[PDB]
Amino acid sequence: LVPELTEDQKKKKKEIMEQESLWKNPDFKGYNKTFQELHQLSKTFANNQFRLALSNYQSGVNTIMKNRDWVEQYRKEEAEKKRLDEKWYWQKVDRKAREERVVYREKMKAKQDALNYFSKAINHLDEIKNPDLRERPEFKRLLSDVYRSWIMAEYDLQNLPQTIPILELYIEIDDNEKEYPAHKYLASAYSFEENMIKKTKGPDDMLFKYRYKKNVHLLRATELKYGKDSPEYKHIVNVINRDE
Amino acid sequence: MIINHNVSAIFAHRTLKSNDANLSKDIEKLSSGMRINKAGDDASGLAVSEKMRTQIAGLRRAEQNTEDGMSLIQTAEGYLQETHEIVQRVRVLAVQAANGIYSEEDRQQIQVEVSQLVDEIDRIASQAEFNKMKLLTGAFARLNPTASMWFHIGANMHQRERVYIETMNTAALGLRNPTVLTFISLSTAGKANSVIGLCDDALRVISKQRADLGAYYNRMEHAAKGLMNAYENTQASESRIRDTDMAEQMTSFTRYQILTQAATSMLAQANMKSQSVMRLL
């Protein structure tokens, strides 16, 4: 995460190492944890947490990629295998349905595993408590990648409401607000929340706030992709005006 | 004859003193019921007897420790009985929910009970206790423990055995994600089908844990019986060394009592002896 010059500072650091040498005790455990917990603001702790989060993120991305490769290979192998008992069309339809079931189950399993890895990475990055080090470009890049991967996996597992806080955190990193897929995901998730409030006869304030959020983010996604004063933008304005 | 001193009287008194001391020692053995009452009687016998007395007091205490240990193990296996019946109930609900004749509302009504049963599993795990000590949370597990449970089942320094109890909540049973904290759902026929396999694994983990505790319990029963056997043998050994035989000791008391009377009579005779020559003046 961070790569770890004044003569006075060098002298201070030398005297600190000299002090630490006198009180060398590998078996020391601080009864009061506050001074030890000050290490969470150090560079070494930040680098270790960054590396742990990176390892978890690579594990999740690898899981997704291996699932895609496995699905491609399974389709190819099933296509290249001889079927000497298959002579009707409905048998081929049934075989295709069975293959689709297998592929779907494998995809969901892999998505669940990758989401576990992404959640572990999120937790690892969460415990970096230095505001200065959280502003580094590398931290922002890794955080955006982890948030994006978690959002897509969670959406694929049909857990739409859980994506909203992560998407809102995402659109505040750098210029991530300018990306239209984030707003498309937000519009879908807010639509799900509004439909849930509608079907459960929940409070009207919740319904109105969810509908307003969905309309705002749908309009923003339409503007970001097709541009202002476009046929798509005019159509979306018409839909929003009719809905509200 | 000599009158200034009486040699016969000195001999009779000297014998009387020895007999009287021996009489006191016989009284002490008869009044207390112990063959050795002072270190001067038999030093090695007193040493071995007191060591066996430490062993005897230890063997009852060690036996009492073993019964208390069996109470803990029995208490733990009582809690797991309720966990097993809840997972069996969830397992039979999953079979019903997997049938295709049901709609979304019926499956949600099944999930309503599922949520309560999962919460009851978690409550059992959290609140199971022996003497204000939690048992099913994982503190005594083999991997990453926060505590160790040792039963001291002997009368000496290092005679202790270890017992492990593993985590028995929903996360440990495979019924809840330990990172996301979401648990099983029967609200869909496809998910209900997957739960049938998950319940089987959970029942397998509970069944293995009950078999472990049953093994610990059976072992402590064998040790408790041996501890009772060892105490009986040690007390027999200590009794033979330390306790006096009343019948044999009463014979010794009567011999010395008669000896004291005979010497007393002779002392009286010796004192009158010198008066014989007084008639010569």
Side-chain angles (χ1 to χ4, degrees):
Chain A
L1 166 71
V2 82
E4 80 212 40
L5 279 147
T6 317
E7 179 88 333
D8 269 5
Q9 297 205 321
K10 222 155 259 183
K11 166 221 48 76
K12 167 66 153 337
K13 100 139 166 179
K14 183 217 74 43
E15 91 178 47
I16 274 149
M17 325 214 320
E18 288 227 25
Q19 286 169 15
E20 261 164 18
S21 182
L22 281 173
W23 293 82
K24 208 209 300 305
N25 189 17
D27 292 301
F28 172 78
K29 277 136 212 96
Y31 177 77
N32 196 15
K33 304 294 184 287
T34 320
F35 195 81
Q36 162 57 225
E37 268 161 17
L38 282 184
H39 160 69
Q40 297 159 343
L41 307 168
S42 69
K43 281 170 174 170
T44 299
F45 175 83
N47 276 318
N48 302 334
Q49 296 295 314
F50 191 91
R51 274 194 315 264
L52 279 166
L54 204 30
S55 161
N56 279 300
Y57 172 73
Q58 305 276 39
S59 276
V61 171
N62 283 347
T63 302
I64 299 289
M65 293 345 305
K66 303 300 143 79
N67 177 246
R68 274 183 201 164
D69 303 335
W70 181 94
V71 165
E72 154 261 320
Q73 189 63 231
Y74 176 78
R75 289 222 170 100
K76 167 218 207 83
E77 254 152 46
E78 287 302 292
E80 280 164 39
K81 155 163 27 193
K82 299 175 190 293
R83 321 278 184 176
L84 310 182
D85 59 315
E86 186 168 282
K87 81 179 284 191
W88 308 121
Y89 182 65
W90 62 264
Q91 299 177 330
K92 316 209 174 83
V93 193
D94 277 6
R95 203 187 95 238
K96 184 186 151 350
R98 278 194 311 278
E99 275 150 28
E100 292 313 307
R101 287 208 303 276
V102 166
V103 155
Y104 178 79
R105 165 192 349 127
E106 248 56 46
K107 278 167 144 161
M108 305 279 87
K109 211 142 306 197
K111 290 277 169 58
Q112 188 47 252
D113 288 332
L115 185 82
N116 285 333
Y117 281 126
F118 295 147
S119 313
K120 262 162 218 193
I122 274 172
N123 288 325
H124 276 318
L125 278 179
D126 255 30
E127 45 217 14
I128 289 170
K129 280 313 153 33
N130 208 322
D132 260 303
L133 259 50
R134 288 188 72 96
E135 220 70 49
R136 298 187 63 82
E138 317 92 76
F139 184 88
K140 282 156 175 297
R141 205 265 326 140
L142 184 55
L143 196 68
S144 298
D145 287 1
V146 152
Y147 277 176
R148 202 183 306 108
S149 265
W150 195 94
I151 285 155
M152 315 207 253
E154 187 76 302
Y155 195 99
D156 274 359
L157 292 161
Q158 321 240 57
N159 291 311
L160 266 66
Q162 286 103 309
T163 57
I164 295 177
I166 315 297
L167 278 152
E168 265 140 44
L169 286 172
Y170 175 92
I171 60 183
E172 325 260 341
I173 312 172
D174 293 330
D175 41 298
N176 283 352
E177 202 269 340
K178 282 318 190 263
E179 314 188 9
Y180 89 87
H183 296 276
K184 162 183 65 111
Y185 273 78
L186 270 176
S188 267
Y190 277 122
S191 175
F192 184 89
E193 296 271 75
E194 183 209 332
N195 287 6
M196 269 327 285
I197 297 290
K198 212 168 317 152
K199 113 190 307 193
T200 57
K201 302 166 56 114
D204 270 309
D205 322 310
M206 275 312 72
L207 176 86
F208 286 160
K209 190 198 324 293
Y210 289 152
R211 186 184 294 149
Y212 164 81
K213 283 290 221 209
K214 157 199 95 173
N215 280 330
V216 163
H217 285 302
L218 174 78
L219 189 64
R220 184 82 171 110
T222 301
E223 164 194 53
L224 278 175
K225 192 194 182 189
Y226 304 102
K228 204 152 154 31
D229 59 87
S230 70
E232 283 96 358
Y233 182 116
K234 273 326 179 273
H235 176 69
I236 277 292
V237 157
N238 289 21
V239 183
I240 276 144
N241 174 271
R242 263 193 299 280
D243 191 53
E244 73 184 301
Chain B
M1 203 219 196
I2 267 71
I3 52 142
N4 211 33
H5 298 278
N6 195 347
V7 169
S8 268
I10 294 166
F11 181 90
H13 166 256
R14 202 182 87 229
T15 319
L16 196 50
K17 267 186 41 90
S18 286
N19 291 335
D20 266 307
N22 291 321
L23 190 55
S24 306
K25 267 142 82 193
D26 274 326
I27 288 174
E28 262 150 51
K29 293 180 176 70
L30 289 168
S31 58
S32 84
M34 279 200 295
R35 193 193 137 241
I36 315 159
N37 302 286
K38 274 134 201 207
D41 309 337
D42 185 40
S44 42
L46 180 61
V48 172
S49 178
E50 291 294 351
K51 263 181 291 156
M52 305 197 161
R53 279 181 181 198
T54 314
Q55 289 307 293
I56 283 148
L59 287 176
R60 325 289 334 260
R61 192 54 248 177
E63 212 265 312
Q64 284 170 295
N65 288 0
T66 311
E67 322 274 51
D68 288 315
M70 284 189 273
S71 300
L72 195 149
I73 292 148
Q74 168 173 321
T75 290
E77 214 253 332
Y79 286 115
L80 291 173
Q81 164 80 264
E82 195 196 330
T83 311
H84 164 82
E85 316 215 302
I86 286 154
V87 183
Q88 265 168 331
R89 174 63 177 171
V90 175
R91 163 86 162 61
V92 85
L93 286 171
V95 168
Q96 174 175 20
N99 205 38
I101 75 90
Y102 292 110
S103 60
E104 264 82 327
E105 282 155 30
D106 317 319
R107 293 206 181 82
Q108 183 166 61
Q109 290 200 13
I110 304 192
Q111 187 60 24
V112 162
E113 186 185 349
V114 171
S115 327
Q116 287 305 130
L117 297 171
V118 162
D119 214 80
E120 183 68 18
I121 292 177
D122 286 293
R123 185 193 82 67
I124 296 154
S126 295
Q127 292 172 15
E129 160 265 356
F130 187 90
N131 195 43
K132 297 263 192 35
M133 275 192 316
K134 266 88 178 83
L135 313 158
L136 308 180
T137 278
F140 303 106
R142 186 187 243 103
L143 255 294
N144 332 306
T146 61
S148 41
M149 162 57 75
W150 290 84
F151 292 140
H152 199 92
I153 57 171
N156 301 286
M157 179 143 45
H158 307 293
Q159 325 199 301
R160 38 211 294 117
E161 296 298 317
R162 174 96 164 264
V163 154
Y164 302 107
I165 311 175
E166 317 305 293
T167 316
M168 294 277 121
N169 53 30
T170 55
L173 286 176
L175 305 185
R176 157 180 260 115
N177 196 308
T179 309
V180 192
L181 300 185
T182 54
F183 55 93
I184 59 164
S185 176
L186 293 191
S187 71
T188 278
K191 280 205 273 242
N193 176 67
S194 297
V195 162
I196 295 151
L198 280 182
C199 285
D200 279 309
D201 297 325
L203 292 162
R204 185 170 68 244
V205 172
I206 293 159
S207 185
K208 174 87 204 319
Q209 182 67 80
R210 291 171 86 190
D212 291 8
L213 294 167
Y216 290 132
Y217 181 80
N218 282 354
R219 159 169 201 189
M220 301 273 264
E221 261 193 7
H222 285 285
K225 274 198 64 223
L227 278 170
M228 278 312 290
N229 197 314
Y231 161 81
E232 193 197 286
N233 289 323
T234 322
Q235 184 63 90
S237 310
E238 207 273 329
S239 196
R240 291 183 237 210
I241 287 165
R242 190 62 173 281
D243 295 348
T244 166
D245 186 328
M246 288 281 127
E248 189 163 40
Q249 203 63 47
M250 198 70 207
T251 299
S252 192
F253 176 83
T254 308
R255 165 145 217 147
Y256 283 121
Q257 200 161 66
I258 275 180
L259 283 169
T260 303
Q261 271 152 52
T264 312
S265 294
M266 281 309 75
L267 192 34
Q269 304 274 353
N271 283 325
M272 329 168 189
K273 259 210 325 175
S274 42
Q275 322 236 33
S276 36
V277 275
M278 284 329 289
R279 79 198 37 236
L280 298 176
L281 306 158

